[PDB]
Amino acid sequence: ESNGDVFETGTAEMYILSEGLFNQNNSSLARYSFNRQRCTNNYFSANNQRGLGDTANDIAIYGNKIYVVVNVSSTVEVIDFPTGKSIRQISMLRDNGSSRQPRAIAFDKDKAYICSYDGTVARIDTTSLEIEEIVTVGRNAEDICVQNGKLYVSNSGGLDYSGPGVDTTVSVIDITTFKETKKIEVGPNPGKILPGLEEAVYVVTRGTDIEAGDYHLVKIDSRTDAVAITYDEKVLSFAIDGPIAYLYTYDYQTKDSANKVFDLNAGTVIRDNFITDGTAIQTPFSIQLNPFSGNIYITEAYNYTVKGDVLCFNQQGQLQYRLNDIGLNPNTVVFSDKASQN
Template sequence: MKQFNLKALLVATTLTAILASCSKDKTPTPEIPAAERAGIYVLNEGGFRSNNSTLTYYDFASKAIIPNIFSVTNAGAELGDTGNDVQVYGSKMYIVVNYSSTIEVVNPKTAKSIKQIELRDAGVGRQPRIIVFNKNKAFISTYDGKVAVLDTASLAVEKFINVGRNPEQMVIANGKLYVANSGGLDSFTAIGPDKTVSVIDLATLTETKKIEVGLNPINIAADAYGDVYVISYGTDYPAKPVLTIINNSTDVVKSSASIDAGYAADFVVNGDLAYYITDAGKVKVYDVKTDVVSKENFISDGTALVLPYALAIDSTTGELFVTDAVSYGSNGALYAFDKTGKKEYSFTVGINPGSIAFVNK
């Protein structure tokens, strides 16, 4: 289980999950020219309230590793406390630093700071979690029950949208933003966790409804077949989480079933397949077209991971990148596997490597 208040929640809670099966009609998607990758960033959370988040960069051509590139590039400045998400969008990279309540906007080719955005309400940190993008807007979930709307040109926050309690991951599908409302900070109180997904109309930037799912939803993803996937963790981890599938045309729940995902394990969709980490240290492959597990472990060469923590798929090569937290208190590692599941290389990263981003040439 992940360290208190790191990538998943500021609370250890848990799960009961879902797998279902039905045929789907794929929505055609336009062909996009393959990008040429320059390298990969790993955002290391550090320890909660330890103020030691770091950003590791690995250059694909030179094989050079820069362990704390943000500090190196920015005259010794540090990221802050609990880096939670990193994403490249357009000509900028956005680093969400949860407990420091900041968004660091940097040049993705150099990690040079462009602007630091503070997210506070009357001096109290909003605790941002996840960032996603649509056109010229960035959407940031914040633990005070809001989604911040940021203009990606001016880098100004334009508004806050009310959602549920302690929102976590978000995904955009069918002109809507789906927000997993965890309520994780209330998991061990009389109130209990939230159990909803907020639906935000991207045209009006308003919440239109809430969809009931399992208790403590954290992870959310979408496929090209019109489905949104939500993993909820309940309050009795390591009992199995629940995977809820929502039709994004009707916003009606299609199915709910248990899934053996590890705590706050990302559900990463790439084409017809999704990937997620289990408590047993495996990376399972799930077919989103048929809604069944198609492979018990993507890793095919026997490579063993201690505490697999985050994963990402490079859609241009089919490579899978998995971080290993090792002990939650020491430096972790990143492993690269080819599209057949064989290890290509690995290298040391920082403490609790929780998010991965690719940068193009």
């Protein structure tokens, strides 16, 4: 169930999103209350008497709402934060009525922006919860963030691995006009994209063949909308803490992996093994900072067919605590400094 004193600084609660398995309709949403000292595994269903859906791929708290992007069900579930009750299921559909297959969400002002596999971004209003506009980006949008009055969308072209091939750009959208202003060439199969200091946007590129392990982190400059730096370190996913990145890399062929601390300014490894206390992770599956405490959260997916765990590390790579069997394939952890009225 749990190991270590389960404890956080400055944080009332965390939510853990589990994707389950492709076409098993078994995504789930867990909640651990720090205030109440209480773990609920099935917080969406328990409160709404229906499942979150198939391949839940993203979660964010913003305003007083929780948004879950559901890829295969092709929906954005919106949940009232205080009560935990569904407000709305927003169906994400092509003009012909087919699945857009949304991937990721980002917010600016009172608007949300969702990117999908069909190569589009949808603007959604955070009050009306209606889709207002669509704009096209590149192929198979994978991820999205905001930096400097602009959205940056990873054009993975991931689903084209066998046809035209993976895509190679980050689209830039101007928020005020919701017009796509440029495609910045970054490298093959871009993925996770996070904003950083000095108007920086960082993106991983996963290579033309994901099994090969040709992973780069690229830094974009948002002032000029050009690449600033391409690093040499093999990065599959990362989280930023100022000029420090917490990253990992995983080899699908050899199941070997590494978790590291990395200096974004010098482009050098600070510590070759983030973990300093000898805690094993077989399948690191996400990595993110708790912004209220600066702890590092990594998920363990094991072999993708048993329930995964959540692990909390201080920045010195000592494990604080872990929550075991939290969900099937936990891929995102999020944090509230304010308790839900639940």
